[PDB]
Design an enzyme around this catalytic site. Structure first.
Site, PDB file in Angstrom:
ATOM      1  N   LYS B 111      24.987 -44.765-106.303  1.00  0.00           N
ATOM      2  CA  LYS B 111      24.100 -45.468-107.223  1.00  0.00           C
ATOM      3  C   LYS B 111      24.794 -45.525-108.573  1.00  0.00           C
ATOM      4  O   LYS B 111      24.832 -44.534-109.305  1.00  0.00           O
ATOM      5  CB  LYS B 111      22.755 -44.762-107.343  1.00  0.00           C
ATOM      6  CG  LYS B 111      21.900 -44.787-106.101  1.00  0.00           C
ATOM      7  CD  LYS B 111      20.544 -44.167-106.391  1.00  0.00           C
ATOM      8  CE  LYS B 111      19.628 -44.203-105.178  1.00  0.00           C
ATOM      9  NZ  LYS B 111      18.301 -43.601-105.486  1.00  0.00           N
ATOM     10  N   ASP B 198       3.137 -44.389-107.422  1.00  0.00           N
ATOM     11  CA  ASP B 198       3.615 -45.383-106.465  1.00  0.00           C
ATOM     12  C   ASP B 198       3.900 -44.659-105.153  1.00  0.00           C
ATOM     13  O   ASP B 198       5.043 -44.369-104.796  1.00  0.00           O
ATOM     14  CB  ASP B 198       4.852 -46.105-106.987  1.00  0.00           C
ATOM     15  CG  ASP B 198       5.134 -47.380-106.224  1.00  0.00           C
ATOM     16  OD1 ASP B 198       4.274 -47.782-105.413  1.00  0.00           O
ATOM     17  OD2 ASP B 198       6.224 -47.956-106.398  1.00  0.00           O
TER      18      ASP B 198
END
EC number: 2.7.11.1
Lengths: 48, 271
Positions: B111, B198
RNA sequence: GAUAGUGGCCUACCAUGGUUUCAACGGGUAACGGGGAAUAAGGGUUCGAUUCCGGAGAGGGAGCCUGAGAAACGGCUACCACAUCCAAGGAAGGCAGCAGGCGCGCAAAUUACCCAAUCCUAAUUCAGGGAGGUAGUGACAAUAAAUAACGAUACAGGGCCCAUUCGGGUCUUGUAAUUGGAAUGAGUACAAUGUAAAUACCUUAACGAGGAACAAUUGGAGGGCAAGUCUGGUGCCAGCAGCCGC
RNA sequence: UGAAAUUCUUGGAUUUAUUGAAGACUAACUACUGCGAAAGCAUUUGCCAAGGACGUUUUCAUUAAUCAAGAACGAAAGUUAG
RNA sequence: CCACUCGGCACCUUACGAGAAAUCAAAGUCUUUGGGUUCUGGGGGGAGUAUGGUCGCAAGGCUGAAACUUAAAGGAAUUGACGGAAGGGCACCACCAGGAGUGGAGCCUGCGGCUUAAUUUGACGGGGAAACUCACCAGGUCCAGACACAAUAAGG
RNA sequence: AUUUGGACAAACUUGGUCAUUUAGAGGAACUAAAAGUCGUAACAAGGUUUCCGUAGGUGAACCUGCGGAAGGAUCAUUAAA
């Protein structure tokens, strides 16, 4: 006059990087150890 | 070793001032002649690893996103990490996710963070460090989560996990224990002091080991949404987590709860 | 008293003086003093072992004979330090004179010829003189100044006036390892001069150059500071080096 | 005190009022200034001994200027003994 | 209060003149260089260090080097380029009032990646698409090359 | 030949002192065109009115007393012209 004891690869770094060709000598008249530059010979082929 | 060391030196010639002129990259490197410094800077600029800002009577050198990661690769050459680079699975907002491999040959996840001159780099650095510390906190508490390998100043290299999201998962056989799991895990979140708002279908990742022993786990990736219980709005955040689990299990798995689900007032006697 | 002779020069007896910031005394000198040398508009700075004058010394100290004159070293005596021959008992020694050797060091010449000059010494015109002169070695400095000079051709120009056009001459270049006839010493050398004898110089018979080799070198060509906007290699001994350096 | 914790306070702190003791300072007035060789000097009053400037139809008549040697004083801090 | 006069501490202009400048009624009367006199300095470090002397109970003070090292260290003045100051526009490629939505499902289509023998090649390329367009692969093929110049000739 | 006493006085020995040539032996420290190791290299940054004298504690550094200097950026506000 003097007697060569050593050949010396002295280094000059900044701002000019060069490998100075010198010679450590012991002088005959004094008993004095002096380093000195030797010009124009990249090999020092005339000096032992 | 040597060229990477001098590139580390001009990396360390960034944490001195603002936008760095030419003779500082000449002298911080401390190299021999005009040759190495100037031809290195030209190799940077032609590979877009550096840029020229000429503000009046003042040459300066502007590092973009390109000429950093090599040093991170060098930083990851130090820490036994990745040798081969590049397979695109997921271009996120605050990171770009790649599939990479080490010298050992195991595929990993790279990432890179892109969040110029100092602040893009430095905020990507703060984001990578913050996410690495949050991953460390989750693994230290014992949450089932991917294991971090390293956080190469602004690029996080971690493991790959064989999972697929729950939107393509029809059901399992042990549905009420899965509901008790996805209730008790949000209970464990409230017992940590946090609420992952979430808690959707795309978050929850299931690894599948066998069909007889049933020794599997979960992966929860909700990092820019976890909110402490002391904040203003955590009540219906917790309730949205619980009720998204319940409405998914009613819609997809067709399962209604026989035990009543936990409230925030239920979990106020937790942590 | 001693001396050639005054004089604390020394001795006996008395006094307690003498020198000093106007620098005594002590210390250093890679300090012999001067006439002079180098360098400047002036004033100054720095050298002077070294050709003339004076001083001092002859390995270091000391002492003395002779004589008008020496505290003499090409005279003596003793010690100290070196050093020579030896049949081991003894015996000789002073190159800071001319040559020459070792050592020392950046650093310095021939173990030649001669008293013909210039002078000096003696019993003296005649003898003697490494004083001195001569030659060798000598790029210590200093003076003078060979390594080429004329033509004709062409070819390329330029200029001068006549150009109406050609061409009519005056120059001056450039080249063409194109051509021509000249001049002369470096060198060799009969002779003569020279000189104590010579060598060399000044003269001079006879030879002696197109000189594609009787071959001029030493340091440079970024700036200071005259000279490259040239080519190749380098760019792993290389942006490099009185200074700045690109 | 950016922030906070040691200390004291139910026998009473802190603050308030009436007193008393000690030692140190000499505000505002205080500059648009003064004095002193400088360092330095701000309450009253007194004593002592100086000093500048001013004024002078007083006196002496070169006694002077700058000063190696030498000599006094010298903030603050610091040493010894009350 | 006014006018004058000495003797001060300060001020404010100018520049005649000085200085590199800031500035200076002296830091002026200085190359057109001389009133008298005391002290000090000779690029920067090493270094107010070492040693010696002297003064002091001590702390220290005064006096005071060299070896070595180096091309600058400086003094004054001048400009704006990395100031992360704040203020306005003025915009639905910004926000609020919302509307339609995408990202959620399937599929069409463009890019990347993989694979290949090629998945030609750019960052819509008028790049709509079996042939062409095709620029890519598996193959199979034509047609090369002038003039000069040595041979070769019309029975070849 | 020998010999007494004098002045001149070379030298010699003994000590003790400086000033040295040394040789050896003992120790200490500086360096690397040397090579590898850990500590803060491959580490974070941080302090920033500046000085002068004196005293103290210090630590890799530097702070705190006492007294001086500016070699530190005077706006407004009373009056004047």
């Amino acid at each position: 006059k003097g007697i060569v004891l050593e050949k010396l690869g002295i280094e000059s770094k900044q701002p000019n990087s060069a490998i100075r060709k010198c010679v450590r000598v012991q002088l005959i008249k004094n008993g004095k150890k002096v380093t000195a530059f030797v010009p124009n010979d990249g090999c020092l082929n005339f000096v032992d | 070793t040597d060229d990477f060391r001098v590139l580390q030196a001009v990396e360390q010639g960034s944490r001195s001032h603002e936008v760095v002129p030419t003779p500082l990259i000449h002298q911080i490197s401390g190299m021999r002649s005009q040759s190495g410094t100037n031809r290195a800077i030209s190799d940077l600029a032609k590979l877009s690893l550096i840029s020229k800002m000429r503000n009046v009577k003042y040459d300066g050198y502007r590092l973009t996103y390109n000429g950093i990661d090599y040093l991170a690769l060098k930083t990851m050459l130090n820490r036994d990490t990745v040798y081969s680079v590049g397979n695109t699975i997921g271009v996120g907002k605050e990171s770009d996710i790649y599939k990479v491999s080490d010298k050992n040959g195991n595929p990993r996840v790279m990432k890179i963070h892109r969040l110029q001159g100092a602040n893009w780099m430095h905020l990507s650095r703060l984001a990578a460090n913050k996410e690495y510390q949050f991953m460390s906190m989750l693994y230290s508490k014992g949450f089932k989560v991917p294991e971090p390998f390293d956080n190469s100043r602004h690029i996080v290299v971690m493991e790959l996990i064989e999972g697929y999201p729950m939107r393509r998962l029809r059901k399992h056989k042990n549905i009420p224990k899965l509901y008790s799991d996805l209730m008790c895990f949000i209970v464990d979140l409230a017992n940590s002091g946090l609420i992952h708002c979430d808690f959707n279908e795309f978050n929850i990742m299931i690894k599948d080991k066998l069909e007889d022993e049933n020794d599997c786990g979960f992966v929860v990736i909700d990092f820019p949404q976890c909110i402490s219980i002391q904040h203003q709005d955590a009540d219906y955040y917790f309730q949205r987590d619980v009720d998204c689990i319940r409405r998914f299990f009613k819609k997809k798995l067709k399962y209604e709860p026989k035990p009543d689900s936990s409230m925030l007032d239920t979990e106020g006697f937790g942590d």
